[PDB]
Amino acid sequence: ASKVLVLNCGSSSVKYKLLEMPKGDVLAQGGVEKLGLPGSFLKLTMPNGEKVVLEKDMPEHTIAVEFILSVLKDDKYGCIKSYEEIDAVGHRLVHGGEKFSNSVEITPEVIAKVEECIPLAPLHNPANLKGVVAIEKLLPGIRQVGVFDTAFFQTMPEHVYRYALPYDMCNKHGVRRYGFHGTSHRYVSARACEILGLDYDKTRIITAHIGNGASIAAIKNGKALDVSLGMTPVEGLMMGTRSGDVDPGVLTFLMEAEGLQAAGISELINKKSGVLGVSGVSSDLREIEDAIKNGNERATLAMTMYDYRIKKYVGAYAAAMGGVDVLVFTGGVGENQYTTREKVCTDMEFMGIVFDSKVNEGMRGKEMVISKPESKVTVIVVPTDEEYMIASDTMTILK
Amino acid sequence: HMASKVLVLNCGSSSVKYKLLEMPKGDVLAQGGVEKLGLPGSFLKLTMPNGEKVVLEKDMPEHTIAVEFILSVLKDDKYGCIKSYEEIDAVGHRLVHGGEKFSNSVEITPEVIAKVEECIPLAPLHNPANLKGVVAIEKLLPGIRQVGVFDTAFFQTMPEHVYRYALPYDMCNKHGVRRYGFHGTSHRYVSARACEILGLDYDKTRIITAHIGNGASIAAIKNGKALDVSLGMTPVEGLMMGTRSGDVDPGVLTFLMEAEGLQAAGISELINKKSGVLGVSGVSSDLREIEDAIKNGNERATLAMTMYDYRIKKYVGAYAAAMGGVDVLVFTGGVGENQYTTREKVCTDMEFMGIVFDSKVNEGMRGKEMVISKPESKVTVIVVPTDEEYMIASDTMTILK
Numbered sequence: 196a197s198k199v200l201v202l203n204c205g206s207s208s209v210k211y212k213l214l215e216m217p218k219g220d221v222l223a224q225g226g227v228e229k230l231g232l233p234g235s236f237l238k239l240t241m242p243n244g245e246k247v248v249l250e251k252d253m254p255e256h257t258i259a260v261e262f263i264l265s266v267l268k269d270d271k272y273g274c275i276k277s278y279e280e281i282d283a284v285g286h287r288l289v290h291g292g293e294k295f296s297n298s299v300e301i302t303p304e305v306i307a308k309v310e311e312c313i314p315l316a317p318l319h320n321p322a323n324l325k326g327v328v329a330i331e332k333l334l335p336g337i338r339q340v341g342v343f344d345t346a347f348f349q350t351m352p353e354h355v356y357r358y359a360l361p362y363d364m365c366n367k368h369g370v371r372r373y374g375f376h377g378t379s380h381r382y383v384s385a386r387a388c389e390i391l392g393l394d395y396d397k398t399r400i401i402t403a404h405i406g407n408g409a410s411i412a413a414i415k416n417g418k419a420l421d422v423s424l425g426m427t428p429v430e431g432l433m434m435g436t437r438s439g440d441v442d443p444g445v446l447t448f449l450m451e452a453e454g455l456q457a458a459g460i461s462e463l464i465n466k467k468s469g470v471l472g473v474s475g476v477s478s479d480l481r482e483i484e485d486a487i488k489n490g491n492e493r494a495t496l497a498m499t500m501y502d503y504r505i506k507k508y509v510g511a512y513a514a515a516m517g518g519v520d521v522l523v524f525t526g527g528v529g530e531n532q533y534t535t536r537e538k539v540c541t542d543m544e545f546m547g548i549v550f551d552s553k554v555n556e557g558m559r560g561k562e563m564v565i566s567k568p569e570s571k572v573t574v575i576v577v578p579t580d581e582e583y584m585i586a587s588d589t590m591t592i593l594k
Numbered sequence: 595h596m597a598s599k600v601l602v603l604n605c606g607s608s609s610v611k612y613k614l615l616e617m618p619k620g621d622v623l624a625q626g627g628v629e630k631l632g633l634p635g636s637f638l639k640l641t642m643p644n645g646e647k648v649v650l651e652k653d654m655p656e657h658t659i660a661v662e663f664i665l666s667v668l669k670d671d672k673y674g675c676i677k678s679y680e681e682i683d684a685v686g687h688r689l690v691h692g693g694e695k696f697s698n699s700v701e702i703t704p705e706v707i708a709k710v711e712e713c714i715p716l717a718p719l720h721n722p723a724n725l726k727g728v729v730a731i732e733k734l735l736p737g738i739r740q741v742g743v744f745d746t747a748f749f750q751t752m753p754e755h756v757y758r759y760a761l762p763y764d765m766c767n768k769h770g771v772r773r774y775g776f777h778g779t780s781h782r783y784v785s786a787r788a789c790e791i792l793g794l795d796y797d798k799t800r801i802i803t804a805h806i807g808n809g810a811s812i813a814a815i816k817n818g819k820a821l822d823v824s825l826g827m828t829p830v831e832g833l834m835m836g837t838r839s840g841d842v843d844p845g846v847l848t849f850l851m852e853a854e855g856l857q858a859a860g861i862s863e864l865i866n867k868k869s870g871v872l873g874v875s876g877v878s879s880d881l882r883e884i885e886d887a888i889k890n891g892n893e894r895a896t897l898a899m900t901m902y903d904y905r906i907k908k909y910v911g912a913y914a915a916a917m918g919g920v921d922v923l924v925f926t927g928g929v930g931e932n933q934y935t936t937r938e939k940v941c942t943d944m945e946f947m948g949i950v951f952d953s954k955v956n957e958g959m960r961g962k963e964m965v966i967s968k969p970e971s972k973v974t975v976i977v978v979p980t981d982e983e984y985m986i987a988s989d990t991m992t993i994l995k
Contacts, residue, residue: 354900358842359834360850361864361873362894368853370846427845433760441759441844443865444828445771449761450858452769457851463762464844472762493763499755503916510915510947511908518946542918546911546947 199586204326256325285589290316291343298588347377350418374422382584406526413512435478438468473497502538547571600987605727661730686990691717692744699989748778751819775823807927814913836879839869874898903939948972
C-alpha cells in the first residue's frame with residue numbers, strides 16, 4: 196500500500212489527486228485556479244462530497260503546490276499527518292514528441308528532452324515542468340514519474356501518422372499525427388480486456404473518449420494503430436467548441452470571406468465551432484438535451500451531426516484493423532450520454548455489433564457491457580481514470 | 595430503331611474535351627480534345643476509328659475558335675464522321691457547379707445561364723469556362739438546343755446533418771459553406787450501371803462508389819439517393835489525390851501558416867498543387883509513374899501508395915457504417931478501373947464487413963466491367979468503367995424529348 200500524489204499543471208491551474216494504491220482510493224482531490232492572477236483559489240472535494248473553496252494568493256506554481264500540500268496536511272481539510280506519507284508523485288506531461296513511448300522516472304535527462312518537445316505543446320509542457328520543479332523544492336528526494344498524453348500513439352506507422360502534405364515542409368516542422376488522451380485510451384483499453392477476460396495483445400479495440408474534447412482510437416493487438424486527433428486537438432470528432440474534421444479548402448475560403456488570419460481561423464475552429472457553433476445553445480450536451488426537449492431544431496441537428504461522425508469513425512477504424520473485438524465508450528459524454536451510444540451502435544450488425552438498447556437506456560457512469568450476449572463485438576462502457584493510470588505507472592516504475 | 599447524335603462537351607480554362615455519341619445506344623462516333631487553348635502551341639488530339647491518336651496543330655486563343663475547329667474536324671472528309679452540322683441533334687455540357695439551385699439537368703436558357711453565373715463563386719475556375727462552351731455552340735450551331743448536367747446535382751439529396759460542417763452556423767449560411775461533392779455524374783452513372791449489371795433494385799440497394807482519378811472521391815448512395823461524399827465544398831477534402839491533400843488536421847494548416855509565413859492563397863496552393871501523391875512521393879501525381887518508381891525501390895513512392903490505399907479503406911468502413919451496411923462496392927475512374935493493386939489492398943482483410951475478395955480475378959484486370967469479389971462474398975465488389983459523356987447525352991435526350 197502506497198500514497199501517490201498525481202498532478203496536472205496548466206498555465207493558470209494545478210489539479211491534484213492523492214490516491215491510495217494499489218486499490219486506487221481517492222484520499223483527496225482538488226484544483227488551484229487563477230494561479231498567477233488576482234483572486235487565485237483552491238477548490239477541493241472532501242471525502243463526504245462537500246466542496247470547499249480556499250482563497251490564497253498563488254502567483255506561480257511552487258506557491259500553488261505548497262498550498263496544496265499544506266491543505267493535504269491541514270487538521271480541518273487534510274487527509275495526512277505528514278508529507279512523508281506521500282510515497283511518490285506522478286505528473287501529466289502533455290507532449291513527449293517522438294522522444295517518449297512510455298512513462299519515465301523524471302531525471303535531468305528526461306527534463307531536457309521534455310523541454311525539446313515544448314514547440315509541440317508550447318502552452319502545456321512548460322507548466323507541466325513547473326509542477327516537477329515545485330515538487331523537487333517542496334518534497335526533496337521524493338521520486339517522480341512523467342506520463343505523456345502522446346506516448347501511447349508512438350506505435351502508429353508512418354502511413355498513418357504522415358499527412359499527405361509537402362514532405363520536406365512537414366519534416367522541417369515536425370508535422371505528423373500525435374494524438375492526445377493517450378493515458379485515457381491506454382487505461383480503458385487495458386481495463387476492458389481485464390474485465391472481459393481477454394488478452395490485450397490479441398484483441399482489436401476501438402476506444403471512444405468522448406468528453407468536451409473527443410477522440411477515438413484503433414488499438415490492434417496491443418498497439419495503437421490510429422487516432423482521430425492529429426498534431427492538434429481540433430482534428431477528428433465533433434467536440435464541445437472544436438470543429439473536428441473540416442474541408443481544408445473551407446478554412447482558406449473563410450479566411451478570404453471573413454478576412455481572418457491564421458490566429459482568427461484558429462480561434463474560430465477551437466472556440467466557436469462544434470456543438471456550440473452548430474447548436475447556438477451550449478458546448479454542454481446536457482444543455483443541448485434540454486434545448487432538444489424544448490424543440491430547439493439546431494440543438495437536434497448538432498446531436499445528429501455529432502453521433503453520425505462517431506459512427507463513421509467506428510466503421511473506419513474497424514476497416515483499418517481488419518475487424519473489431521471490443522468497442523469501449525468512455526469520457527464525460529461517453530460514460531453518460533446513453534442516447535449517443537445507442538445511435539452509434541444501432542444498425543451496425545453488418546460489422547458484428549448487436550446492441551442491447553434496454554441495458555444501455557438510462558445507464559450513466561458505470562462499467563457495463565451494453566452489447567447483447569450474442570454480439571460478436573463486445574460494446575462496453577468503461578469510466579476512465581487517468582489519475583489512477585498515472586499512479587499505476589508511477590508505482591510500476593519506482594518498484 | 596431511330597438514332598440521334600449528341601455532341602458532349604467538357605470545357606475548362608485551357609481545354610475542350612468532346613465526344614459525339616449516337617443515342618440511345620451510346621456508340622462513340624468521335625472523340626478528342628483541344629489542349630493549350632489560349633496559349634502558344636494549342637492543338638486538337640482526336641482518336642480515329644482505328645484507335646490511333648492524331649494531332650492537329652492550330653492557333654486557338656479562345657473557346658469559340660476552339661469549338662469551331664472541333665466542329666470542322668467532325669465534318670472533315672478525312673477525320674470526320676458526319677457530312678454536315680445538321681446531323682448534330684443536340685449538345686450536352688458538363689457544368690461543374692449548380693449550387694443548391696440544381697438537383698438535375700436542365701435545358702440551357704437565359705434564366706438558367708443567370709443561375710449558373712450565380713454559382714460561379716462556388717467554382718470560380720470552372721463555371722466560367724463551362725459557359726464559354728455554351729456561348730460558342732449558340733454562335734456556331736443555328737437552331738441547336740443545349741442541356742447542362744451538373745457535377746454537384748446528384749449530391750443535392752444529402753441531409754443537413756451530413757452536408758453541414760461543425761463550424762459557426764450563421765457564418766456558414768451567410769457564405770454558402772456546405773458539402774457539395776463533385777464527380778456526381780460519374781457516381782450517378784456507375785451506381786445505376788452496377789445495379790443493372792447485378793440485377794438489383796437501385797432504390798433498395800446500399801452502394802459505395804469510389805471514383806478514383808486524378809481527382810478522387812467516394813460516395814455513399816443509399817436506397818437510390820446520395821447520402822455522403824468525401825469531397826467537400828472544395829475538391830481538396832477527403833481521399834488523397836494526385837496533388838491534393840485530402841483530409842488533414844485543420845490545426846496543421848494554421849500551424850503551417852504561422853511557421854512558413856503563408857497567407858490563405860499560399861496555403862491553398864500548397865494543399866491543391868503540392869500535396870497528395872505528388873507531395874509525399876516526390877515523384878509524380880501519376881500512379882503509373884509511382885508504380886514504376888516502386889519497382890525501382892523508391893520508398894517514398896511506396897509510402898505514398900500505402901497512405902493512399904489506407905485512406906480509401908477507412909472511407910469504405912465509414913460509409914458502410916453510415917448506411918448500416920453495404921451491398922455493392924464499385925471502383926471506377928482512371929485509377930479505380932486500372933490500379934488493381936489498390937483495389938486489392940482496399941478490399942483484403944474486410945471479411946468482418948462482408949467482403950471476400952477474388953485476388954486472382956482482380957490481378958491485371960484493367961478497364962473492364964468485372965466483379966472482383968468471390969461468388970460467396972456477402973458484399974459484391976465490382977469495377978464499372980465510368981461513362982460521364984453517355985450520362986450527359988442520356989439526360990440531354992430526356993430533356994429535349
